[PDB]
Amino acid sequence: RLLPTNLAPHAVGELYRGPDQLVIGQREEDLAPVILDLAANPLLMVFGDARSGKTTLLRHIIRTVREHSTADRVAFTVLDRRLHLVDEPLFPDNEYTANIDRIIPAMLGLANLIEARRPPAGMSAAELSRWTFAGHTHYLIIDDVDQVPDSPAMTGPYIGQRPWTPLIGLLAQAGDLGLRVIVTGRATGSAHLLMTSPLLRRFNDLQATTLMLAGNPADSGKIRGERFARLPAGRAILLTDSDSPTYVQLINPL
Numbered sequence: 001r002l003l004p005t006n007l008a009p010h011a012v013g014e015l016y017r018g019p020d021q022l023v024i025g026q027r028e029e030d031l032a033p034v035i036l037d038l039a040a041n042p043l044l045m046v047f048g049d050a051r052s053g054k055t056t057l058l059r060h061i062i063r064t065v066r067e068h069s070t071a072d073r074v075a076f077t078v079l080d081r082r083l084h085l086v087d088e089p090l091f092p093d094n095e096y097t098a099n100i101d102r103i104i105p106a107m108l109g110l111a112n113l114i115e116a117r118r119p120p121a122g123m124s125a126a127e128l129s130r131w132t133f134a135g136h137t138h139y140l141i142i143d144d145v146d147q148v149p150d151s152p153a154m155t156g157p158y159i160g161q162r163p164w165t166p167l168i169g170l171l172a173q174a175g176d177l178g179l180r181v182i183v184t185g186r187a188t189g190s191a192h193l194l195m196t197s198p199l200l201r202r203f204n205d206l207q208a209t210t211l212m213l214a215g216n217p218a219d220s221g222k223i224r225g226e227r228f229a230r231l232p233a234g235r236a237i238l239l240t241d242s243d244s245p246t247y248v249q250l251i252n253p254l
């Protein structure tokens with residue numbers, strides 16, 4: 001079927017189908033809504049070369065989660081060095097930073113928060129009793145994650161420390177501890193990053209949902225056997241747990 005080139009946020013029915021169930025576009029087969037289930041798969045990585053739609057998809061998610069949530073149930077943490085998401089409102093007191101030097105402590109403190117939700121040792125088949133957690137589902141949004149140096153810090157109070165270290169051990173249980181993580185990066189270089197970045201290698205080892213926006217069919221490498229294609233803005237290959245790769249068009253907000 002013929003996908004659109006500019007998909008309006010009202011052409012797809014209800015955008016919010018329940019907590020963590022977000023319509024993000026239409027699929028090529030039948031133009032049916034594409035529904036991101038962040039409770040089932042809390043991790044999403046989006047790869048695309050210049051101006052293909054990474055940040056716009058982040059904006060769409062933030063706006064859709066925010067419009068149908070209350071501040072005492074949902075919190076965002078947004079890391080955005082290029083500042084293209086300053087526009088988008090969060091909830092009160094929510095961390096938005098573009099400062100490469102605030103990332104290390106911000107992640108340490110987010111990690112301490114999610115870590116405190118884990119169940120005690122000594123349980124064994126008594127936790128699958130709605131153990132859950134008391135408070136916010138926390139959406140961690142990292143635009144252009146491939147542009148944050150992931151090497152030990154050379155200067156400042158956190159010398160020798162790396163930005164993503166406290167996050168890694170959380171990713172496997174993010175769905176039980178009220179954590180979602182959404183990141184974006186260029187298409188070129190992405191396959192190598194999937195192998196060398198501790199953060200993105202863990203995303204891939206955990207089969208994170210992947211959106212492959214436009215990229216180079218030669219250089220950008222293979223993700224789960226798929227090459228990038230030269231696509232218009234917002235057109236992506238969607239890789240999930242349950243279906244084979246799917247062409248989709250993402251909603252263009254505003």
Ligand SMILES: Nc1ncnc2c1ncn2[C@@H]1O[C@H](COP(=O)(O)OP(=O)(O)OP(=O)(O)O)[C@@H](O)[C@H]1O
Pocket residue numbers: 005006007048049050051052053054055056057084233234235249250251252253
């Ligand atoms: N889902 C969409 N549908 C139609 N057009 C889009 C879509 N997403 C992005 N665009 C077009 O591409 C432009 C750039 O989008 P965006 O800033 O999200 O790209 P990016 O991949 O984040 O760019 P950069 O590589 O600079 O970070 C938008 O201004 C719009 O013109």
Ligand SMILES: [Mg+2]
Pocket residue numbers: 054055056084143
């Ligand atoms: Mg961008």
